[PDB]
């Protein structure tokens, strides 16, 4: 029994539907193949900083990302690289809401207000040693799904 | 007084309609009690005559046909062809006997004219072809046994029981 | 009336010496059944050096043994060194098949003893080896390694006999008995059953070993075809008497499952003076000369 | 009657068991277990009798006369034994289970077939009319179970599906009623169809390779290689002790069998095989 | 009992053995047969299945070749011996699941054609993983022995 | 008393240990560890006896007759051994742990399951009747633990939460803290529900690829590749040594066993597997 | 100390007058809980005297009397004819044990003169005619067990045991 | 011969009446076995055209439509544009299989030529809008399975599934 593969299935379902343009999907595939090895070597917090820096957390994309947590009709817009980093960010946050590491209400109230994403990063920094051990198999499954389903250039 | 009647069971498809008084009363000789078909009459010296199947009476005791016994008379279009009889339940010998019979009842057996045209090329036939069991159970095993699908549910066993027990002899033509 | 002996576990009916394992018979001899019944009905006051006298006093005429598997009745049938259990529906045409033509003879009889043979579907032969251990070394005591081929039952089996007297058939019901050889167990149950008697047919089936008075041995043997159509004739011991702790006797017998011709009856009836007539009447009382008709389940003794 | 009372009991294997039989090259196992008639493990009545006789002679060296004359005197054979054991019948063998989306996640269950339960019901019927041996509830449970023959049955109604001994997928259903547990163990009992049950059970047996090593150089001695079969811990056999009316039987059954819980059965006891618990079905259920 | 599985494995191996037209692809599939059963029973069926599909290059052309194999027996697998061997082994597993009533054949062929239902196939396989791993070991070992016996060591 | 002396002991692994029961039908590349009936690793008492006997016959070369009496002759035996070993039950296996937050964290912990403790209870109860021994202390500890059989518990520690073997999240409940330690190291002991315990224990095993290399050209030799399964260091098994009265048993128990500390079980001893410490429950508790 | 008296279970009703204090302490071994009876002692070598049933000490090991051990003083009109003995609670033949006992305890037994003017020929006696247990339960099993009919609602199962779990040997003298 | 009809399950109001049989016999393949819907048919490559809703065929395998199959003959306003055809009850992609198949069938399906004046722009449509399942309960699951409320006391069960057990590609234009 490996339920992180089912969690990866449902998260990959959501993000594979939320990426309209195929270039966005291929970009997410490259993100998935890179960031798991990056979080292995470098740790969770540096990789998370890198991810949120390349994700362009404007309230627009933040709102599409919040709506992904409920809708399955939400869409991620932006450049292919931007949306791929946002999709990987949603992957991580989805794993965190599931597995109860972070309350969903706190996550949503942080993604809404800009004065609270800092508290979100603080909580994630406090929990990073746990997250680093937990999410490895989930992210490896995400990577396998990406390179299985999304074609490459 | 009571009368009964013989129903021969070959794989032959000459069973379509011969009986009208199927229940008639309430009791018939044979039965099925959750462990196979009971009171299956053996008859010696008779064989199937496949052409519009009936029982040719030959003069070899090696020749035997098995069947069942049900209450009533068939269709009242015969007794010019059937060998209607009466016995004290003692000279006919079946298997699986459960209760002491009423010491006398009548019998209706489908009989065939001897009519020696050529030699009776007798052959043995053991029941095969599960599909034939599946269509004959709807044919007769239920039109008589309305009890079936009410009391008896081990249907695959009464399939399992006749394929290797029920056998008969034939004329090849 | 009818007695079903239901073995609770594999049985052992030792036959023909002990000298790989000692073999068991299929159907227990009538002496074993009579001895078990006398063991139940015993009283420690009627002792006499005649084991069968004290045994005939304890019970009544017992009719031979066959097999009830699951409502079916199986019966022994032998062709000579070939035992089988068949349902009577295959004994009907047997006499016809007996003096039937040659190749048809072998076709039919070898189809009977091989494919219609329900023995192996019923009986397994289970070798059991035991040893003895001396209570201080905890290693096998020297020279104590014995083996025996027990008679195991794949499906539930009963031995069927018919007893005439109905008084004993009350204190026989539901008794757990030490049926057979090395301390094995069977349950007796009594039920009222209807069985015809003494039909005058030409071919009978020896349900039990038909004894031979050792006086007409040469007479009976030098023309054997006149009496048995098929079966086996063998010298059998009559068992072991509990009272005096010895073997019983040895007599030539027609082993159970043989096909006897009607003539044998009159033959046995003409070669017994009063003395051995009484002797063999006792033998038949405890159950040796039982015949059944290939027609239907109808028994009869030869003398009685 | 000359079998006046009967004592049904259970045989719980505390350690693995090896009641040996005829060693021979036909069974890919040098030292196989005693097979019954259907290929199931069994304990012969002679093995039970001898082992329990030895154990009792050691533990009660004063009741030695009672024991000798109930279970058969060895040095004076002139009198039949007043006591008799039936062959021990396999009642349940433990099986490793993988739950499949069920309520109570178990790791092992008891597995039976319908052949074994038929034999147990045979033993139980044949002794129920002894006016003291009654145990109606036990055979009533066995009969409710036997009615459902043909279907892989579970008693505790939560499984609906499982993988047995890592190799056999079976689907289970309840008994339409709770059928209070036969034994008081907190493990569900699975009565399987016979064809799949033989496979599950034959896979539940322990097959071990054993060697003889030269003490000096820790090399294996030439020819010292063989295999044995064990019956696992927790395995349950069912047998009956039958006793005639004599009065030493009364005192035997009184204070020899009341203080009889653990016993050594079978061989290889220096390997710790054979420790057994005897549960009498006259106090439990 | 799993004795029909040897017949099943013989025919499935004949399928994929004719489908792989390049001999290097045969040897690649040989290495797959000898590695992936070990890995299935050491890491679990779901991890190894994700690993197999990630390496299989499941594009619609390859999937059509798979389906044709499921039907034609004249089909041919293409595409980079590593990928083609992983896809041949994917077909081995799927062929078992089809011929053993674990997965309905029409639902599978639908999955290998559309795209939304490929994730549905993976999810269903996820829920059937204990059963599949328990039931397929004899078959996969038969495939391993056949590949060692029939395809020359590279 | 059927047994003169009864000493349970623990089998603390000093190095990784590999007891055999070699390649199965399917995994011809693996050399697995000996398994129990319900799947956990075990040491068959035949392996225990052979190893301990071979050890004693060299460590005490002058008490060789006492050893041949208690553990059986091997030149020409003329009677059974007087000593029995029970099979080693897996008692506790080490598992890596990532504790969320509590008093200064641990990096590893001892993991056991309720089924294993139930087998220990069976051993202790059976030998408390076949001997004058009574382990009421260990038995009371084990029954206090088995009282909480539903929930994953932890002994004399809280931890309230953990990741075991970096794959299994468990929620832990502190039992009562009144129960003192059993294997009194500093590390805590987790009693897991057996469904999760089976997975944790299987992860705590050690599977190792091994090869054989050509000496001249430093390449793998054709075929020289296989897998072996090790039980990790610090693993604790449980067994009992039992003996009947001999006056050689008194010597064995008072001389040999009081001076038996380290032995070498299983195989692959040249690569350092098999060193083991025995602990003799009657003093460690 | 803790003390008990052994009360028989016959098919005669003089039994309810054998004790004074119902509970006395806090320990009754003979307790019934939702399955059946437990810790009933079975004396051997005694024979009942059903006309004022008192276990006459005989020598026959086959003779036995099954009754329950209850804490209480016997009638406070005894200790001159009753059999009083203290035994260490481990050599006591009791069937259906559930829990260990206090390692020693004092026991009061209904007793009598042997009456050696009548050949003591005992007789195996059951408890049948469930009305004869119907009354004694509401006679004994209520003044000994208040817990019945306030914890026991399946009284049928406290019938289906006394039906056969309680036998004895009587003297019919 | 026995023949069935396929009632598509869209969101729109095409589900008032299309039938000439309401019950007729008793054999419907779709059942409500206390656990939701069993034996649900799926047609692939076809798309609903809810404007006069009858399945428009495409050649895209991702295009599909789920519905329940029942016996009948549609409204007797057809045989002009319906694709009645004979399938041996196995070639049809049936999901949620509980029962078995009759091994031979012939079904009627609401068909329409694809009116090739439009590019067939099919897009998925998931059944939702809780007040629409409230009317799908009646318009089909009562005009066919008026079995509703006869044994289905858990209607709020068999509404969870329809909310997710059905979906289809529609022209959307």
TrEMBL record, chain A:
Keywords: Antiviral defense, Cytoplasm. GO terms for cellular component: cytoplasm. One of its GO terms (biological process) is defense response to virus. It is found in: Cytoplasm. InterPro entries: AF1862-like_dom_sf, CRISPR-assoc_prot_Cmr5. Belongs to the CRISPR system Cmr5 family. This is CRISPR type III-B/RAMP module-associated protein Cmr5. It comes from Saccharolobus islandicus (strain REY15A).
UniProtKB/TrEMBL annotation, chains B, G, H:
InterPro entries: Cmr7A (IPR043959), CRISPR_Cmr7_comp (IPR053743). Signal peptide: none annotated. It comes from the Archaea. Gene3D superfamilies: 2.60.120.1670. GO terms for biological process: CRISPR-cas system; defense response to virus. It comes from Saccharolobus islandicus (strain REY15A). This is CRISPR-associated protein Cmrx. The lineage of its organism: Archaea, Thermoproteota, Thermoprotei, Sulfolobales, Sulfolobaceae.
Automatic annotation (TrEMBL), chain C:
Pfam families: Cas_Cmr3 (PF09700). InterPro entries: CRISPR-assoc_protein_Cmr3, CRISPR-Cmr3_IIIB, CRISPR_assoc_ribonuclease. Gene3D superfamilies: 3.30.70.2940. Transmembrane segments: none annotated. It comes from the Archaea. PANTHER family: CRISPR SYSTEM CMR SUBUNIT CMR3 (PTHR37169:SF2), CRISPR SYSTEM ENDORIBONUCLEASE CSX1-RELATED (PTHR37169). NCBIfam families: cas_cmr3 (TIGR01888). This is CRISPR-associated protein, Cmr3 family.
Automatic annotation (TrEMBL), chains D, F:
InterPro entries: CRISPR-assoc_RAMP_Cmr4, RAMP_III_fam. It comes from the Archaea. GO terms for biological process: defense response to virus. Residues 11-277 form the CRISPR type III-associated protein domain. It holds the Pfam family RAMPs. Keywords: Antiviral defense. NCBIfam families: cas_RAMP_Cmr4 (TIGR02580). This is CRISPR-associated RAMP protein, Cmr4 family. It comes from Saccharolobus islandicus (strain REY15A) (Sulfolobus islandicus).
């Amino acid at each position: 029994y490996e339920e992180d593969y089912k969690l990866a299935l449902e998260a990959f379902k959501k993000v594979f539907n939320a990426l309209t343009h195929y270039g966005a999907k291929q970009a997410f595939r490259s993100r998935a193949r890179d960031l798991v090895e990056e979080i292995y070597n470098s740790g969770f917090i540096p990789t998370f900083f890198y991810i949120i820096s390349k994700a362009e957390l404007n309230s627009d994309s933040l709102d599409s990302l919040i709506s992904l947590f409920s809708s399955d009709n939400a869409i991620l817009r932006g450049s292919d690289e931007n949306v791929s980093y946002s999709a990987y960010l949603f992957i991580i946050l989805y794993y965190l809401i599931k597995r109860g590491i972070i309350e969903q209400k706190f996550l949503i109230q942080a993604l809404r207000c800009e004065k609270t994403r800092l508290d979100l990063i603080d909580k994630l920094y406090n929990l990073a040693p746990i997250i680093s051990a937990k999410i490895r198999t989930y992210l490896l499954a995400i990577k396998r799904l990406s390179e299985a389903l999304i074609e490459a250039r | 007084s009571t009368q009964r009647e013989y129903v021969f069971i070959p794989i032959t498809n000459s069973i379509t309609i011969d009986v009208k008084i199927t229940i008639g009363g309430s009791d018939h000789i044979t039965n099925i009690d959750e462990r196979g078909i009971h009171n299956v009459l053996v008859i010696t010296g008779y064989a199937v005559d496949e052409k519009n199947g009936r029982l040719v009476p030959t003069l070899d005791p090696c020749d035997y046909v098995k069947g069942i016994l049900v209450a009533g008379t068939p269709q009242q279009a015969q007794s010019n062809d059937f060998l209607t009889l009466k016995l004290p339940a003692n000279k006919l010998y079946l298997i699986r006997k459960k209760g002491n019979i009423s010491d006398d009842l009548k019998i209706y057996i489908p009989y065939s004219s001897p009519d020696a045209r050529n030699s009776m090329k007798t052959k043995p036939v053991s029941i095969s072809d599960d599909t034939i069991v599946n269509n004959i159970i709807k044919e007769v095993f239920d039109k008589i046994y309305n009890i079936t699908q009410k009391e008896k549910v081990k249907i695959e066993k009464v399939k399992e029981d006749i394929k290797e027990l029920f056998s008969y002899y034939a004329l090849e033509q | 009336k009818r007695v079903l002996i239901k073995p609770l576990e594999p049985l052992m009916f030792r036959s023909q010496g002990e000298f790989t394992a000692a073999q068991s018979l299929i159907i227990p001899r009538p002496s074993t059944i009579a001895g078990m019944l006398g063991y139940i009905l015993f009283n420690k006051s009627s002792g006499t050096g005649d084991w069968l006298s004290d045994l005939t006093n304890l019970l009544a005429t017992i009719y031979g043994t066959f097999i009830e598997t699951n409502g079916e009745y199986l019966f022994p049938l032998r062709m000579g060194n070939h035992l089988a259990l068949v349902d009577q529906q295959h004994l009907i045409n047997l006499p016809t098949l007996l003096e039937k033509e040659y190749e048809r003879r072998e076709k039919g009889i070898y189809e009977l003893f091989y494919d219609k043979n329900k023995l192996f579907q019923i009986i397994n032969h289970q070798d059991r080896i035991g040893i003895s251990i001396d209570k201080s070394t905890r290693t096998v005591k020297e020279h104590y390694l014995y083996s025996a081929r027990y008679l195991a039952f794949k499906k539930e089996v009963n031995y069927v006999i018919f007893i005439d007297n109905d008084a004993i058939s009350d204190k026989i019901n539901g008794k757990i008995v030490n049926f057979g050889g090395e301390n094995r167990i069977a349950k007796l149950e009594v039920d009222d059953y209807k069985v015809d008697t003494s039909i005058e047919e030409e071919y009978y089936l020896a349900l039990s070993p038909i004894l031979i008075p050792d006086e007409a041995l040469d007479n009976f043997l030098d023309n054997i075809s006149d009496y048995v159509a098929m079966g086996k004739v063998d010298k059998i011991s009559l068992g072991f008497d509990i009272a005096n702790t010895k073997r019983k006797e040895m007599l030539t017998a027609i082993l159970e499952g043989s096909i006897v011709k009607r003539s044998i009856i009159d033959f046995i009836k003409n070669e017994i003076k009063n003395d051995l007539r009484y002797r063999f009447s006792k033998y038949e009382k405890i159950g040796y000369n039982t015949l059944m008709s290939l027609c239907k389940l109808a028994l009869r003794k030869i003398l009685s | 009657p000359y079998y006046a009372f009967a004592e049904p009991f259970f045989i719980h294997a505390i350690t693995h068991l090896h009641v040996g039989s005829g060693s021979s090259v036909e069974e890919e196992i040098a030292l196989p277990f005693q097979r019954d008639e259907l290929g199931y493990p069994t304990i012969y009545a002679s093995s039970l009798k001898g082992a329990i006789k030895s154990f009792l002679l050691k533990e009660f060296p004063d009741k030695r006369d009672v024991i000798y004359k109930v279970l058969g005197e060895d040095e004076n054979p002139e009198e039949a034994s007043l006591g008799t054991f039936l062959d021990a019948i396999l009642f349940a063998i433990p099986s490793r289970i993988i739950e499949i989306d069920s309520a109570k996640p178990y790791v092992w269950v008891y597995v039976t077939t319908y052949e074994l339960l038929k034999k147990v019901k045979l033993y139980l019927d044949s002794i129920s009319q002894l006016s003291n041996a009654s145990f109606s509830n036990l055979k009533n449970k066995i009969d409710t179970i036997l009615a459902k023959e043909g279907k892989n049955i579970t008693l505790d109604s939560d499984l609906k599906s499982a993988i047995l001994n890592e190799d056999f997928y079976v689907e289970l259903e309840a008994l339409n009623n709770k059928i209070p547990s036969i034994i008081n163990a907190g493990v569900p009992l699975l009565v399987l169809e016979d064809s799949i049950g033989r496979e599950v059970i034959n896979r539940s047996l322990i097959r071990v390779r054993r060697i003889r090593i030269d003490r000096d150089k820790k090399v294996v001695e030439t020819g010292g290689l063989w295999s044995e079969e064990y019956v696992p811990m927790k395995t349950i056999f069912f047998s009956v002790l039958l006793g005639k009316e004599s009065k030493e039987s009364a005192i035997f059954a009184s204070c020899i069998l009341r203080n009889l819980r653990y016993v050594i059965l079978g061989g290889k006891e220096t390997i710790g095989k054979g420790i057994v618990e005897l549960r009498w079905v006259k106090d439990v259920i």
